[PDB]
């Protein structure tokens, strides 16, 4: 059958019994850095069993009148085990990810999500003169949520979270040009994306640059008759792939 997968990374295994196919990047697989493109002169650290495993983020609830969520994920994994320790003692670092969003419901529920993973997402602020601060842009393994209203401008520093403009000023329908999948509760049960390292430099600092953004937007909202289970959660498990670091220093 074409509905069962099994992904094994490190000492963790994610299985699924009904699913769509897996979408992989822009056609490439995450691999290490070659000697033609390297610019640093110290030998990198590849632990590759301790940091290449599945880390499970916190769960969010899919209500009926929900709008959306987003994570960043060079930053959502900053407190998760030995991946968050190598980010502190090192100055550089590159990695690729594999993302597995999972959300299950019965045959009597209905709904549809859009699981997209965009690179270099600059967000717009509510106040037209300032740029948004750090704690309004990203939370460590905690989802920041879209709204379906318009955020006022006289707040200090807040992201404009109108969901039909997706926070970046583009149409939310045209977000399907990025690598994406749909979780349709009629057929699908989980989405899987394998993302390579997309950046204009071969290595970058991991504490002041978030080169990805995982957005989950419900296009057709959740609905059910009276009697079914009203609590439907969403859980996201991310796993780094082929990670390496340079520039060992103090803790910061």
């Amino acid at each position, epitope marked *: 059958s074409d509905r069962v997968r099994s992904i094994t990374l490190g000492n963790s295994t994610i299985t699924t019994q009904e699913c769509a196919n897996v979408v992989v990047g822009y056609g490439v697989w995450p691999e290490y850095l070659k000697d033609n493109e390297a610019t640093a002169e110290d030998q990198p650290t590849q632990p590759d069993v301790a940091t290449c495993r599945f880390y499970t983020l916190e769960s969010v609830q899919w209500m009926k009148n929900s709008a959306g969520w987003w994570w960043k994920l060079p930053d959502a994994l900053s407190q998760m085990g030995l991946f968050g320790q190598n980010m502190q003692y090192h100055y550089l670092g590159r990695t690729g990810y594999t993302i597995h969003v999972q959300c299950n419901a019965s045959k009597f529920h209905q709904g549809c999500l859009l699981v997209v993973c965009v690179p270099e997402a600059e967000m717009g602020c509510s106040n037209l003169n300032n740029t948004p601060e750090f704690s309004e842009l990203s939370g460590g393994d905690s989802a920041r949520m879209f709204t379906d209203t318009q955020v006022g401008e006289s707040n*200090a520093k807040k992201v404009q979270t109108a969901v039909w403009n997706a926070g970046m000023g583009v149409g939310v329908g045209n977000l399907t040009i990025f690598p994406h999948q749909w979780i349709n509760l009629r057929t699908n049960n989980s989405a899987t994306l394998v993302m390579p390292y997309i950046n204009s430099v071969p290595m970058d600092n991991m504490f002041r640059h978030n080169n990805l953004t995982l957005m989950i937007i419900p296009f057709v909202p959740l609905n059910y008759s009276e009697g079914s289970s009203p609590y439907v959660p969403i859980t996201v498990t991310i796993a780094p792939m082929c990670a390496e670091y340079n520039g060992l220093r103090l803790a910061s």
Partner: antibody
Amino acid sequence: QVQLKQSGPGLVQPSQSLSITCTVSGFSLTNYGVHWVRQSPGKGLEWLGVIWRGGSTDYNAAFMSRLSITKDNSKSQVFFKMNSLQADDTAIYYCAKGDYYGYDAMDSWGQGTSVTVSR
Amino acid sequence: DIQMTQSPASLSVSVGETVTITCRASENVYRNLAWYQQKQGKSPQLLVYAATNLADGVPSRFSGSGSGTQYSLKINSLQSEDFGSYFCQHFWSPVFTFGAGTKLELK
């Protein structure tokens, strides 16, 4: 899950300072902001000030020169201070957290301490 | 700033009928409105946020609607535990202002 609660002085002399400490439980100050709302019997409900999740504050216009709200992220406590305490400040003061699914509404409120400004 | 004029100031109705409480802003707030309910001598509880959405534990008797400047709240079947006060409080812009207040005697 149990939520925030406060503790105040109760009775304050005129032209003095007032300080209620609202301590929280079950969440962090790195994700939510705590408002301060004054329930008055004569002027009704009114909004005094807020401290956001980033640390910046935003006060009311009429209470600008007297209010000062700070917090500590580690001990999970917020502090507020009003000065010069005139006669109409006999009311009950609430602390309440914001960001109800990103919508900046108050979900849970403190028990409220009733203050009196008189001798 | 912006004022919220709430009407009517009081009501006297019985158990099981449909009422409607409205409040009007000064200018457009883009559906940034929250409704509260306060009983005698406790803290106010959030009832309807963002002018349409329901809260966590609030049953489906309450319903809020409106857009632009005119908003409303409607209970189709009023019950015995639902008296008290009701306020509307916009969060579009600091300074946030509350409503005047409505009272339900349930006579």
